[PDB]
Amino acid sequence: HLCGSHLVEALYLVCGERGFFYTPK
Amino acid sequence: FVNQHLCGSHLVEALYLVCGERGFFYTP
Amino acid sequence: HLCGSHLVEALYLVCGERGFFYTPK
Amino acid sequence: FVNQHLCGSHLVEALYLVCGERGFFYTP
Amino acid sequence: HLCGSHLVEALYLVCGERGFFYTPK
Amino acid sequence: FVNQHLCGSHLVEALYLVCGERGFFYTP
Amino acid sequence: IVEQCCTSICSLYQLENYCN
Amino acid sequence: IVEQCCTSICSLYQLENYCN
Amino acid sequence: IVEQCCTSICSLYQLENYCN
Amino acid sequence: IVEQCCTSICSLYQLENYCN
Amino acid sequence: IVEQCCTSICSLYQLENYCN
Amino acid sequence: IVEQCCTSICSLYQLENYCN
Ligand SMILES: NCCc1c[nH]c2ccc(O)cc12
Numbered sequence A, C, E: 001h002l003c004g005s006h007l008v009e010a011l012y013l014v015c016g017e018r019g020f021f022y023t024p025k
Numbered sequence B, D, F: 001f002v003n004q005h006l007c008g009s010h011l012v013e014a015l016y017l018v019c020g021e022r023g024f025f026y027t028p
Numbered sequence G, H, I, J, K, L: 001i002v003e004q005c006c007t008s009i010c011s012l013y014q015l016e017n018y019c020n
């Protein structure tokens, strides 16, 4: 269960070197 | 740059709160 | 919804350069 | 001092847990 | 109430200099 | 090493997600 | 603080209030 | 993202999808 | 650990137990 | 963002330039 | 606190001096 | 882990060597 800033933290573990988009809606 | 990588961790947390329902884009 | 350490993280984004008090009760 | 600013982020998280219902004061 | 990564953060405040094991199950 | 201590904070968060129900061991 | 931002919803603009 | 990883459960492998 | 500190409430003093 | 914001302390306006 | 605690690793006693 | 991973950026394989 990955919600709020924890979802962003998880996105960063995986993609932080490549970069990513976060678009909740 | 390790200290930038650590720093990036903090920035995305800050963008998360700063941006709201709009979301954000992160890119080194 | 900003509770526990997330409320403190949010307080810090805004005030971390000025300083602040956190007094839950 | 960026690395102190990053460091401050960690300290307030630590004071949050350390202090309990008392709360804390943070000041550079 | 210390769950998920917050429990790990709390484990780290106390033990981060000594080291620790985290074994949820 | 302060910046390693800060760095350790990030590693355990990363191991938490990386490892799952297995858990992990942290040791300087 | 907790009522303003955890019970009710909050703004980063509103939290400027608590800066010392 | 939120459905995939907050509503339903997610994998770190599945989140590689969102890397730009 | 999870019962002690997530299910029941915990102390930072009690978590010294788990330091290796 | 890294260039601008891991160098000097950025401000909440520097940061808001990376909202969508 | 920054002076004392972002310089050397502080201890949980250094930190507790900033509780209210 | 500190030696390997606070020096260079580690990868998710370096990290997974510290799972139980
Ligand atoms: N005004 C400081 C906002 C802020 C919070 N965390 C940060 C991390 C890096 C940075 O450049 C800026 C920040």
Ligand SMILES: NCCc1c[nH]c2ccc(O)cc12
Binding pocket: D010, D011, D014, E012, E013, E014, E016, E017, K004, K005, K006, K007, K008, K009, K010, K011, K012
């Ligand atoms: N005994 C280490 C406690 C601790 C946790 N995080 C910290 C950050 C800075 C510091 O000086 C100390 C700490």
Ligand SMILES: NCCc1c[nH]c2ccc(O)cc12
Binding pocket: A012, A013, A014, A016, A017, F010, F011, F014, L004, L005, L006, L007, L008, L009, L010, L011, L012
């Ligand atoms: N592939 C980067 C994963 C990662 C996330 N956080 C980290 C902190 C330190 C490190 O060496 C590596 C990481």
Ligand SMILES: NC(=[NH2+])NCCC[C@H](N)C(=O)O
Binding pocket: A001, A002, A003, A004, A005, A006, A007, A009, A010, E003, E004, E005, E006, F013, F017
């Ligand atoms: N570093 C992380 N992303 N940790 C995940 C923690 C899970 C947390 N209980 C949540 O609401 O998602």
Ligand SMILES: NC(=[NH2+])NCCC[C@H](N)C(=O)O
Binding pocket: A003, A004, A005, A006, B013, B017, C001, C002, C003, C004, C005, C006, C007, C009, C010
């Ligand atoms: N960096 C932050 N303050 N994030 C806010 C995350 C919201 C979280 N679900 C909470 O209980 O408040």
Ligand SMILES: NC(=[NH2+])NCCC[C@H](N)C(=O)O
Binding pocket: C003, C004, C005, C006, D013, D017, E001, E002, E003, E004, E005, E006, E007, E009, E010
């Ligand atoms: N830095 C920390 N460990 N903070 C504890 C925050 C409590 C959080 N609501 C939880 O699910 O546990």
Ligand SMILES: [Cl-]
Binding pocket: none
């Ligand atoms: Cl939570």
Ligand SMILES: [Cl-]
Binding pocket: B006, B007, D006, D007, F006, F007
């Ligand atoms: Cl850091």
Ligand SMILES: [Zn+2]
Binding pocket: A006, C006, E006
């Ligand atoms: Zn949380």
Ligand SMILES: [Zn+2]
Binding pocket: B006, B010, D006, D010, F006, F010
């Ligand atoms: Zn950090």
